[PDB]
């Protein structure tokens, strides 16, 4: 997992990418409370985190060498064999994973939830996978929906997304989900200072992802949809 009272999601709450209110649902689902909970593709958020941590080459604000980043994660690995296209059960043609974040309606009481899941796939036409995934969303979605009742907690919007890769040949393939829990560094906050801890936060809470980039002199990377997942 969760993100609660101490939380802020890079992309939604701090460093907002414009895209987020520009967005529009894939659909809605009734909750036990009764509100139609909109579900949106998680492209903006994912993309945000890239801009901030950076890529192996374009290194920006990444977790320190040797640190202990507690995370919510699941992973999966398997082969799709040397040729022997016979399946010793932990093998598959393709691997897939997903994460889902549902912002709580009222952060004073209920906690925002992450739901992340993953697996392997036993067919080899991409369409079949693609299809399974877009289906899966609704499972996760209705799942987010009845999920609240134990907690008597209703959400406000769930953002969901995927990464897959189709294998062949005796390659091994891995797919993961990870929500990290970090603390921001000073120079990522323009005009922040180690003496101004909470003002430092409100600066990140007031810049849009664009703005942040400009003041930092960092070229975009989400920009024109250029990141695959």
């Amino acid at each position: 997992x969760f993100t609660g009272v101490q939380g802020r999601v890079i992309g939604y709450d701090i460093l907002r990418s414009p895209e987020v209110d520009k967005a529009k649902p894939l659909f809605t689902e009734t909750q036990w409370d009764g509100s139609e909970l909109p579900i949106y593709d998680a492209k903006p958020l994912q993309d945000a985190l890239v801009e901030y941590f950076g890529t192996e080459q374009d290194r920006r604000h990444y977790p320190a060498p040797g640190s202990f980043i507690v995370c919510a994660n699941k992973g999966v690995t398997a082969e799709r064999p040397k040729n022997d296209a016979d399946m010793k059960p932990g093998q598959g043609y393709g691997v897939w994973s997903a994460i889902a974040i549902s912002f709580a309606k009222d952060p004073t009481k209920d906690s925002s939830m992450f739901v992340e899941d993953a697996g392997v796939w036993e067919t080899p036409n991409e369409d079949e996978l693609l299809e399974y995934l877009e289906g899966r969303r609704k499972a996760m979605a209705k799942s987010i929906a009845e999920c609240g009742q134990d907690a008597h907690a209703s959400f406000e919007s769930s953002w969901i997304g995927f990464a897959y890769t189709m294998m062949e040949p005796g390659q091994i393939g891995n797919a993961i989900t990870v929500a990290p829990y970090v603390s921001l560094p000073i120079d990522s906050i323009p005009g922040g200072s180690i003496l101004t801890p909470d003002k430092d936060m409100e600066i990140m809470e007031n810049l849009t992802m664009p703005e942040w980039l400009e003041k930092m002199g960092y070229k975009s990377l989400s920009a024109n949809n250029a990141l695959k997942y």
Partner: protein, 70 residues
């Protein structure tokens, strides 16, 4: 934001500043100023060949000691 204001009177703050040059670090590691955390979303997938590469792609959380929370 407004929420912080209603949140602070409970004793909860959401500051999460790290004292390192450039590097982010994790919730609970000593020396962090603040008592909150900042999270994000990362899902990526990749490849190796018979006889790391998820993590290092797209958003880097590379060379990290992961601790699972469920």
């Amino acid at each position: 934001s407004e929420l912080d204001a209603k949140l602070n009177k409970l004793g909860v703050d959401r500051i999460a500043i790290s004292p390192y040059k450039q590097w982010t670090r994790g919730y609970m590691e000593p020396g962090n100023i603040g008592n909150g955390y900042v999270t994000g979303l990362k899902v990526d997938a990749g490849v190796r060949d018979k006889s790391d590469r998820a993590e290092t792609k797209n958003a880097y959380i590379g060379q990290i000691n992961m601790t699972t929370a469920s």
